[PDB]
């Protein structure tokens, strides 16, 4: 029963039909349309263009069109080095890849005059690099300039996450210049183009690959906040091993991990009634909305416990251990914040994820914290 | 303090602004503009004659002078002087001062290569040797035959990088040399604060007015105002999930039910119940996670009831209602 679901985990898209119109001159060897391909994240958009060019290169005339990933540069030189790697040649590399005018000499081909288009992968690392109008916008500016006179032009295909980048362009560039205009976006496929690809990615079909309306149910009730349904099939591939482990069932398993302690399991964290007392003690110190030290909390803990004698006053060292019991369940977090007297000195400020509405319910059942409120 | 504000203005998008701006700057006062340009054309032989005396020529005046300098330097002067000395004509090295990315090292590395490398000047390249290397250039040039070999142009000399003081003194030592003619323009009203009697001794500036009331097309690009957030988050909503449009629509209604300030906002509990009422929000976490996406792109605010409020104006939210949400 394994080998049917061993193969489970692994032209084709209805977005490739768009881009061949957008590359309408790429089979007639002319300069194509003006390509700035954006997208909200997770939407397949990195592999989307990679699907096109791999279908382009396997289809396509002299054949040399290269694509490089802009991740580890922070600087516009070695991209123009990596276009030279499809030549397998040798030259003086440093000057030719550095200046704007130095790129222009690089664009005279050798063997058969096939035009070249570059593909700039993950442009947002250089967009969201160092300060905008100094280097990175200038880097954006310099690449999109295609004023070259022969039709051999370095057509850009760049990609980005957040859609602020168009308004970042200068008003000269927004005057119908370069690869600007066609701001081709990709709205996140709800279930209406992505699930059908999963259907065709179920070409080798096992018998029980589950009631597919539940798969449709999975698609409809994941599409609130999602972009990657194969990865959201990779959460089906984990639950398909649950039915192997036991020889949207799992989204139900995963949300109760996150929703609880405020409604119900707050009292699970405080089986000690003193842990209930010390939890209200933190919030009474939160009146002075300050750097809530473990000492200022201990200050209000003593000066209240001398008034109402519910228990004896305990140690600060005990007060250290008891607040860590509050910590490991995930209620209150402790951080070493800032005080700048001698050096960067670290006093510990706490923060609570509970509200007084979710407090007042669980304390009226216990009239021993009622003196303390 | 009832003040009319730029937020309370009929705003204009990107393509609408720049096109009708391009209509005015190429059709408003066209006839008198070239009519000025023909009048000042007769001054061009006068500039040629004085510039043989090594005079740093400086152009002030209202309006952009960028087009005028490039006509005067490139087409008129630079072949006229090459013909009058007796072959490629005189090299023109412009300096775009409105471009803030001008440094002192890079432009001078061009200069010593533009000027003659007759000696091993890379030996004196050592750590600031720039004033050192130009001093060895100056005293050699005192005993050379007097002829211009280079004319440089510095547009917008009060620019964001050229007005820095270690760059200004660098240009000061260039101007005392007789072989190079220095034709620059500034635009500031406090431009003669830049020079003392030390530098102007090295400069021997003269002045001329040019006022053509040009729009400064290139010089407007790097500059920005609030035209260039209410407009920022106007584009993110155009690419999201369809549910975020609806949960912002229910957000924007009761936040405009009551400028858009804090007081018109809503509590988190009831808004969870309201977005539970239309079968949208499952609980607090599923609400907040796709509300952090409105938080991450700074599209909504929260202050303290637990009030979440939109920081856009009263007029803006109904514009966000009828256009992008609907």
């Amino acid at each position: 029963k394994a080998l049917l679901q061993k193969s489970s985990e692994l032209a084709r898209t209805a977005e490739y039909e768009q881009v061949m119109n957008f590359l309408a001159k790429a089979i007639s060897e002319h300069r194509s349309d003006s390509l700035y391909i954006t997208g909200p994240p997770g939407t397949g958009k990195t592999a989307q263009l990679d699907m096109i060019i791999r279908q382009k290169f396997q289809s396509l005339e002299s054949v040399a069109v290269t694509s490089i990933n802009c991740i580890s540069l922070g600087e516009p030189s070695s991209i123009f080095q990596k276009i030279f790697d499809s030549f397998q040649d040798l030259n003086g590399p440093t000057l030719q890849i550095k200046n704007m005018q130095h790129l222009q000499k690089f664009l005279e081909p050798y063997h058969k005059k096939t035009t070249f288009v570059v593909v700039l992968d993950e442009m947002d690392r250089l967009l969201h690099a160092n300060t905008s109008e100094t280097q990175s916008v200038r880097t954006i500016l310099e690449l999109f300039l295609l004023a070259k006179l022969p039709t051999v032009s370095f057509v850009l295909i760049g990609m980005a996450n957040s859609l602020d980048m168009k308004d970042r362009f200068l008003s000269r560039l927004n005057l119908d210049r370069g690869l600007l205009p066609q701001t081709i976006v990709f709205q996140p496929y709800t279930a209406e183009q992505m699930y059908e690809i999963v259907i065709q990615k179920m070409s080798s079909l096992p018998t029980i690959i589950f009631q597919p309306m539940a798969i449709k149910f999975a698609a409809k009730k994941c599409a609130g906040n999602t972009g990657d349904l194969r990865k959201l099939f990779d959460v089906l591939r984990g639950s398909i091993e649950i039915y192997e482990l036991e020889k949207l069932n799992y989204i139900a398993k995963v949300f109760s991990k996150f929703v609880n302690n405020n409604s119900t399991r707050t009292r699970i964290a405080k089986l000690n009634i003193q842990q209930k007392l010390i939890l209200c003690t933190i919030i009474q110190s939160l009146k002075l909305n300050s750097d809530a030290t473990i000492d200022e909390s201990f200050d209000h803990y003593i000066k209240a416990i001398t008034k109402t004698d519910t228990l004896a006053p305990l140690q600060r060292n005990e007060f250290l251990e008891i607040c860590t019991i509050l910590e490991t369940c995930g209620l209150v977090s402790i951080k070493k914040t800032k005080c700048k007297g001698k050096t960067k000195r670290f006093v510990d400020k706490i923060d609570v994820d509970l509200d007084m509405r979710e407090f007042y319910d669980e304390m009226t059942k216990i009239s021993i914290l009622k003196p303390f409120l | 303090k009832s003040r009319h504000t730029m937020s309370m203005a009929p705003d204009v998008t990107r393509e609408e602004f720049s096109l009708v701006s391009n209509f005015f700057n190429e059709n408003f006062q066209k006839r008198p503009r070239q009519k000025l340009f023909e009048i000042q054309k007769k001054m061009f032989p006068q500039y040629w004659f004085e510039l043989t005396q090594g005079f740093s020529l400086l152009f002030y005046g209202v309006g952009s002078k960028r087009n005028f300098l490039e006509e005067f330097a490139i087409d008129y002067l630079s072949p006229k002087i090459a013909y009058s000395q007796l072959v490629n004509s005189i090299p023109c090295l412009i300096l775009n001062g409105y471009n803030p990315s001008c440094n002192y090292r890079d432009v001078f590395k061009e200069i010593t290569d533009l000027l003659v490398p007759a000696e091993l000047t890379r030996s004196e390249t050592k750590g600031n040797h720039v004033i050192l290397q130009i001093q060895k250039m100056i005293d050699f040039y005192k005993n050379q035959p007097l002829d211009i070999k280079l004319i440089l142009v510095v547009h917008n000399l009060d620019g964001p990088s050229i007005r820095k003081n270690t760059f200004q003194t660098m240009l000061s030592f260039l101007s005392v040399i007789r072989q190079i003619a220095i034709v620059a323009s500034t635009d500031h009203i406090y431009a003669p604060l830049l020079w003392d009697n030390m530098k102007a001794q090295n400069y021997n500036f003269v002045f001329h007015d040019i006022s053509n009331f040009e729009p400064s097309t290139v010089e407007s690009t790097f500059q920005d105002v609030m035209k260039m957030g209410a407009e920022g988050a106007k584009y993110v909503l155009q690419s999201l999930t369809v549910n975020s449009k609806k949960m912002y629509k229910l957000l924007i209604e009761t936040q405009m039910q009551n400028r858009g300030t804090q007081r018109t906002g809503v509590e988190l509990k009831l808004f969870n119940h309201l977005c539970a009422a239309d079968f949208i929000a499952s609980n607090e976490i599923a609400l907040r996670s796709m509300l952090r996406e409105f938080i991450e792109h700074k599209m909504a605010n929260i202050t303290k009831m637990e009030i979440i409020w939109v920081p856009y104006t009263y007029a803006e939210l109904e514009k966000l209602l009828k256009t992008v949400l609907n």
Partner: peptide
Amino acid sequence: ADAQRSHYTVYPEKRWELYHQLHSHFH
């Protein structure tokens, strides 16, 4: 077109002679 790139170089009298005998002599 190129004006946003900084510092791009490019490679494109009976009366006055009586001045010329006077000017340099003064200098």
